[PDB]
Symmetry: C3
Subunit: 380 residues, 3 copies
C-alpha cells in the first residue's frame, strides 16, 4: 500500500515505539523495519449490525369491513364495537334524518363509521447506535490478522512475527451524523434520511414496539354522510411521492456476505499502534508537479463532499496538492481536504481524492503550474 | 493493579515520556520506575450530575370537580368558564333535547363537560448532556490525588512526588448512546429508555418547563351524553404496563454519596499521561495456558454485550485470550482491554460483544480452554 | 503567547518528534528549537456553515378572506373548496337554524368557515451536523499558514521553513451538546435552544422541506357561530413570550463577513502535531505565589460554567492554580491557565458544583476568593 513517513512514527530510548496513522477505506498504510518483514495495515469495512427499528411509515393502505351504525333523532348516540378495537379507523358525525329515511321527526341523527385499517406497503426507519459502530482493520506481514473493532472497544491486542506484541488504540470518524439521521428501508432499497424529515411525513406510522397504527386519517377519507351510509375510501399508493422525495438522499449498501450489515460509504479510523522498541523506516514524499489526468471527474458523495480519481504518469512517488478556491488565481484556499496523504505510490497510478468545497461556486484545483488540473463545482 | 507494558510507554531523548492507557471502572493501572515509588492510576467513577428534565409522563390520572353546561335547541352552543382554564379536560357534543328534558322543541342541544385533571403518579425523563459527563480518576503513590474530569475538560494538570509534574489528557467513551437515550425515573427506580419509545407512549405528558398536561384524553374517557348529563371517567393506573415494558431495560444506579449523580456501569476512559523525562519499567504478560473456571457465568449487560468472570488456577501473571466463534475464527469483539490476572486464584471481568444468532464463547487455549453457548436476538 | 512544557513534546531516537497540545480560541501555543525560528499555533475559529433548517415556528399570524358556507336542516353538510387548500384554517360546526334566518324548519344546520393563514413572523430552527463542524488553526513562524479543519478531516499536513513538513491530527470538543440542541434564529438574533423545548412550543410550525403550516389552531380562534356567520380572529403577536423565554438562553454570533457561518465561541481542539526529528525547548512553569486581581468578575457562560479574568502583579511567567471548594469539588475547564507576562490578563473558566461554592484562585494571603451560586 503506502509507506509511513518519518514524523508518522516515533521510537523511544526506552519502552516502545508508536505509529500514528489515519486509515480510510480503499486505502492501506505499510510499515517497514530493518531485518524485519514489512507490515501492511488497511481499513476493510465500517459497518452497522442490525440497527434497531424505531418506526414504520405507511405509504399504501387498505380499508375493509366498513361498518356503520346510525340513529334517528331522540334515539341517542350511535356506537360500534370496533370503535374500541385498535385496528379500526372510525368517524363520528351527524346526518340529516327525516320521514324520507324512516325517521319520525326531522333532525340531525348520530352516525358512526368504522373501517379496518391495514398497511399494504410500509417504510422502515432504523436508528444507529453510535457506540455499536464496527470497523475491521487487517494487518498482514509480507500471516494475516483480522481485527474486529467497536466504537466502545477501541483497544485491541495482537501479536506479530518479529514485531512481537502490539496494541491498537482506535477511534472511528463517520462521514454522516447519525444523531440527526435514520436509515430508511423501502423494499430492496435503503437510504439515509434526516430524522426530522421522516418524522414530519404526513402518513400513518407505527412505533417499533408495534402498538397500533397512528394518524390513519392521512390515508383515509370519510365522504360526506348520506341518510344512513358513509363511504370510506383509502387513498392511493404514495410510493411515487416518497420515492421522488428520496432522490435527494444517499443510498446505503447492505454488505454482500452477511446482508444484514449496512456498510458506510466513507469516514475514517484514527489509530495509534504501540509496539515494543523497534527502529522503523519512513519515506518522505515530494509534491508532484507534472502530468495529471482525470480518470474520474469529481462527483457528489451525497454527504456534501466530492470525490475524484486522478492519474499520475510523471514522475515519482509524490504527494498531490489539492485546493479549492473561488478564484482561478488560487490565492486563497476555501476548501477542506478530506483525504489524508493523497499520494501516488508509482507513476501511471490512480488515486482517490475527497474534498469539501465551499457553498456556492468554486474551483477545484489539483497540482500546480501549467500541469495543474481544474474543475468547476456548484454546491447547494 | 496491573502493570504497564513496554509498548504502553515511550521515553524521548528530549522532552517528556508518554504513557498510554485505557482505564475502565473496577480496574487499575500502575507505573513503576527504578528507585521511584510505584504510581497507581484508576478510573473511580463515571457519572452524570443533575441531568435536565425534558418531560414528565403520567400513568395515573384523577378527575374531580366535574362540571356540565347544557343548552336547548335554538339557544346556541353551551360554554363553561372551565373551557378557558388550562387545568381542565373538556369535551363538546350534542344531546337529544325534547319535552322530556324541559325543552320546547325536539332537536340536538349543545352540551359541554369539563373535568379537573390531576396526575397522581408520573414518570420523569432526563436527557444526558454528553459534554457534561464526569469521570473521576485517582492516582496514589506507594499520597492520594483525586482528579475530576469532564467531557469538555479533557486535559488536567497534576504534580507528583519524584515523578514531578504530569498532564493527563483523557477521552470518555460511554457504553450506551445517549443521543438515542433518556434516563427514566419511576419513583425510586431509574432506567435507560429509547427516546422514541418514550415519545410514542400513548399517555398524558408535560414539558420540562412545566406548562400544562397534554393529550389528557389518553387517561380520560367521556361517556355518551345523556339528556343533561355526562360521566367522565379516569382510566386505570398504568404502572403495571409501564413496568412490564421496562423489564427489558437496564437500571441506572444513583450515588452512594452525592445522590444526584447517576453512575454509568460501563464505558471506558482512554487517557494519555505526560510526564517529564524519566525511565519507567515495563512488564510483559504471558498468555494464560492452563486451568481456569467460570465463577460467574456469562450474563447479558443490558447494553448488548455479555459479561463473565473467570478464575485462573495455575497461570501466574497472564493475558487471558478470549474469542467468540461460530475450527474457531472469532466473529466477536472484545470489549474488555487487558483482561489480565495478576495472580492465581483471583477473578477477572470479561466483557464480550458476540454476533447476532448463536455463538460460542471460547476462553484460553489448549484442552484447558473454557467454552459457552450463547444466543443473541 | 504561551510556550510548551517539557512533557508536552517527545523526541525519538528514530522517526519524528510529537507535540501534543490543546487549543482553545483566543489562545496560542508556541514551540521553539535551537537555531530555529519560533512557531506559533492558535485556534482562530470554530464554526458551522449553513446548518440545515429543520423547522420554522410561527409567532405571528394573519388571517384573510374569511369564507363561510351555510346549510339548513335536511340540506346536508356544508362545504367549501377552500377546505382542500393547504393554506386555510377551517372549522366545521353547527348553528341554530329556524324561520328567523330563512330556514323552513328548526334544527341544527351545518356550517363551515375557512380563513387564509399567513405567518408574518417566524422563528427558524437549524440542526447542527457534528461531523461538519469546522475549525481553523493558524501557524506562523517568527509567513503565516492557515489550515481549515473538519470533524471528519482531522489529519492535515503543512510545511514551513526549518521545521519541514508537519502533520496535524485534531479532535474537536464542543462546550454545548448539539445532539440535544437547535440554533434558533429570530430576525437578526440567534441562540442555542433545547430541542424538546422548541418541539413542545404551542405554536404553528412548518417542516424544513417546506410544505405547509401545521397546528394553525394555536394562533387562530373561531368565535361561536351565529345564524349564518362565524368570526375568525388571529391571536396577537407572541414575540414577547418567546423572547422572554429566550432570556435564559445562550446567544450565538453569526460572525461579520460571510455570515451564514455561526461561531461556537467555546469548546476546545485537542491536537497532536507530528514533526520530523528535532530537538525542541520546553519551558517550566512555577506556581504563581502572590498578588492577584479580578479585572473581570466571575460570570455565567450560559452553558453551566463561570468565566473570569485575572491580572497578576507579581509572579512573572507562572501557572495559576484554581480550586472550587465546598480540596476542590469542581472542574477546571481552562487549559494551561498561565500568565505569560506580568500585567496581562488570563482567562479562567471553571465548572462549579451545584448549590453554593467558594472559588479560590492563587495561594496564601494573596489567594482570591469568590462566592458563587449555581442553581
Amino acid at each position: 500500500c503506502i509507506g509511513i513517513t518519518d514524523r508518522d512514527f516515533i521510537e523511544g530510548v526506552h519502552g516502545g515505539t508508536w505509529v500514528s496513522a489515519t486509515l480510510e477505506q480503499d486505502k492501506c498504510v505499510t510499515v517497514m523495519a530493518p531485518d524485519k518483514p514489512s507490515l501492511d495495515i488497511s481499513l476493510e469495512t465500517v459497518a452497522i449490525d442490525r440497527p434497531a427499528e424505531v418506526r414504520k411509515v405507511c405509504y399504501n393502505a387498505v380499508l375493509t369491513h366498513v361498518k356503520i351504525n346510525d340513529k334517528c333523532p331522540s334515539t341517542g348516540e350511535a356506537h360500534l364495537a370496533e370503535e374500541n378495537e385498535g385496528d379500526n379507523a372510525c368517524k363520528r358525525t351527524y346526518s340529516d334524518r327525516g320521514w324520507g329515511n324512516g325517521c319520525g321527526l326531522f333532525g340531525k341523527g348520530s352516525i358512526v363509521a368504522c373501517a379496518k385499517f391495514t398497511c399494504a406497503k410500509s417504510m422502515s426507519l432504523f436508528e444507529v447506535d453510535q457506540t455499536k459502530i464496527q470497523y475491521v482493520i487487517r494487518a498482514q506481514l509480507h500471516d494475516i490478522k483480522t481485527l474486529k473493532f467497536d466504537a466502545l472497544s477501541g483497544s485491541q491486542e495482537v501479536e506479530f512475527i518479529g514485531y512481537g506484541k502490539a496494541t491498537l488504540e482506535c477511534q472511528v470518524q463517520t462521514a454522516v451524523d447519525f444523531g440527526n439521521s435514520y436509515i430508511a428501508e423501502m423494499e430492496t432499497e435503503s437510504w439515509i434520511v434526516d430524522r426530522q424529515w421522516a418524522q414530519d411525513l404526513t402518513l400513518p406510522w407505527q412505533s417499533g414496539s408495534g402498538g397500533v397504527w397512528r394518524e390513519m386519517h392521512h390515508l383515509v377519507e370519510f365522504e360526506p354522510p348520506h341518510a344512513a351510509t358513509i363511504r370510506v375510501l383509502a387513498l392511493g399508493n404514495q410510493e411515487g411521492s416518497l420515492k421522488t422525495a428520496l432522490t435527494g438522499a444517499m443510498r446505503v449498501t447492505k454488505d454482500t456476505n452477511d446482508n444484514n450489515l449496512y456498510k458506510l460509504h466513507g469516514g475514517h479510523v484514527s489509530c495509534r499502534v504501540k509496539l515494543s522498541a523497534l527502529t522503523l523506516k519512513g519515506t518522505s514524499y515530494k509534491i508532484c508537479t507534472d502530468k495529471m489526468f482525470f480518470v474520474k471527474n469529481p462527483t457528489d458523495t451525497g454527504h456534501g463532499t466530492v470525490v475524484m480519481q486522478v492519474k499520475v504518469s510523471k514522475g515519482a512517488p509524490c504527494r498531490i496538492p489539492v485546493i479549492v478556491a473561488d478564484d482561478l488565481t488560487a490565492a486563497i484556499n476555501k476548501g477542506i481536504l478530506v483525504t489524508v496523504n493523497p499520494i501516488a505510490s508509482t507513476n501511471d497510478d490512480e488515486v482517490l481524492i475527497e474534498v469539501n468545497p465551499p457553498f456556492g461556486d468554486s474551483y477545484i484545483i489539483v497540482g500546480r503550474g501549467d500541469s495543474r488540473l481544474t474543475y468547476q463545482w456548484h454546491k447547494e
